[PDB]
């Protein structure tokens, strides 16, 4: 119990380097939906609600890719979309012409059928990036309430708690992220099993219910599936993503390192001051998943449970102490007595409502930014967290190689934007905990 081991915990040290860049599968805060009230049929109906399509042009090139290939891929997309327009029976998904641009982007010249003695390349520093403000903005927006509902009230005693939480989260942007991920991962999987040898065009779609109750169908952009041959569950299918955004890539080019960004149209918006014209961009990039990653993505709903459970137990940490059940007290008014943020004014608190959403966002970003860096940090930072809590209450944790623990943690801090955030977060926690 003899406590005397101090403000020994120091801040974690984060990498120097170029700023970290976006690496989620789809866009997050920068996403743009075209919406209305068979995916391809709905895709076209959604695109028809836009009347600013123009000649696509590159505005932010991919420093490592063949950019005209990106431009051509989009043009090909439009072209093939025209072919489908009208007709009579519009297909699901649709197979695309195996053109030069698509072969290239979908890594088809890396196809084993091609090469020589060079077929003997056997080699055996993953490059540090600094934290950037963008990932925190990302998370902020993730905790926000939306003007739409993304989930039914269930899964289409303490069951009362389920309801309270669901009431507080169904309109959360994090929840949209969940559903966006379920739909397009499911979609990508089917296409991957039902084609294998086809370059499929997959609309990125989600559904929601407005405030006024109308059912809405959203189009985020397109994904083109590459060759998907192999039953290896960890084997990867290459795809290229094509996502609509109002976000100018040039404000934070660093965020978009993996992207070619086209300008694909201009949009006329209603505004506090009238009609304003804003460029519409297409964010393009190559990528890949596996049956396993698609499976995990199809199950992001788990974030709701995990998120909930924490909020649940968090009530026991008060209900057993106050003798009476406290779900109603909390959810019906006050106890905005949990810290959840910093501001210019400093420390800041929020109610179980905000908390519900914040924990949802956290669970969701864990899933969106899943990485070995993250597995490590979590496991290891939990320990430092335990220790920091003890010392905070004047408790001796014991003879423990703390510096050893720091090594473990800081070696997970290389370049992942999400992990770097959590590190920065801990530092802030660390400053308040041992003021």
């Amino acid at each position: 119990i003899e406590p005397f081991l101090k403000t020994t915990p120091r801040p974690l040290r984060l990498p120097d380097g170029p700023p970290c860049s976006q690496r989620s599968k789809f866009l997050l805060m920068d996403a743009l939906k075209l919406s209305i009230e068979i995916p391809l049929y709905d895709a076209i109906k959604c695109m028809k609600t836009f009347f600013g399509w123009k000649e696509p042009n590159i505005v932010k090139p991919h420093e490592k890719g063949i950019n005209p290939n990106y431009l051509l891929a989009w043009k090909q997309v439009l072209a093939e979309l025209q072919d489908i327009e009208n007709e009579e029976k519009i297909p699901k998904t649709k197979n695309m012409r195996k053109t030069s641009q698509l072969k290239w982007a979908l890594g088809e010249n890396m196809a084993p059928e091609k090469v020589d003695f060079e077929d003997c390349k056997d080699v055996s520093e993953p490059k540090p990036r600094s934290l950037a403000s963008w990932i925190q903005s990302e998370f902020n927006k993730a905790c926000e309430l939306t003007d739409s509902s993304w989930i039914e009230l269930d899964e289409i005693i303490a069951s009362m708690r389920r309801n309270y939480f669901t009431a507080e989260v169904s309109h959360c942007r994090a929840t949209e992220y969940i559903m966006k991920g379920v739909y397009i991962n499911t979609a990508l999987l089917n296409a991957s099993c039902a084609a294998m040898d086809d370059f499929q065009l997959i609309p990125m779609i989600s559904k929601c219910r407005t405030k006024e109750g109308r059912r809405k169908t959203n189009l985020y952009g397109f994904i083109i599936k590459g060759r998907s041959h192999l039953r290896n569950d960890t084997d990867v299918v290459n795809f290229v993503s094509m996502e609509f955004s109002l976000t100018d890539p040039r404000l934070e080019p660093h965020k978009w390192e993996k992207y070619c960004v086209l300008e694909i149209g201009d949009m006329l918006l209603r505004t506090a001051i009238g009609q304003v014209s804003r460029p519409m961009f297409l964010y393009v990039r190559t990528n890949g998943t596996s049956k396993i990653k698609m499976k995990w993505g199809m199950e992001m709903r788990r974030c709701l449970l995990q998120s909930l459970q924490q909020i649940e137990s968090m009530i026991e940490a008060e209900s057993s102490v106050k003798e009476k059940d406290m779900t109603k007290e909390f959810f019906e008014n006050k106890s905005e007595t949990w810290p959840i943020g910093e501001s210019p004014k400093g420390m800041e608190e929020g109610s179980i409502g905000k908390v519900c959403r914040t924990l949802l966002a956290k669970s969701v970003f864990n899933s969106l930014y899943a990485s070995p860096q993250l597995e490590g940090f979590s496991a290891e930072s939990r320990k430092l967290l335990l220790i920091v809590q003890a010392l905070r209450d004047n408790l001796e944790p014991g003879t423990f190689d703390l510096g050893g623990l720091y090594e473990a943690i800081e070696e997970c801090l290389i370049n992942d934007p999400w992990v770097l955030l959590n590190a920065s977060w801990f530092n802030s926690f660390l400053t308040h905990a041992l003021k």
């Binding site: 810290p339 943020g341 910093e342 914040t358 977060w425």
Partner: peptide, 16 residues
Amino acid sequence: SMDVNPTLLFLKVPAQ
């Protein structure tokens, strides 16, 4: 405006 930080919860909620 508030930058959200879920780790701050642990100023109050005990780890685990």
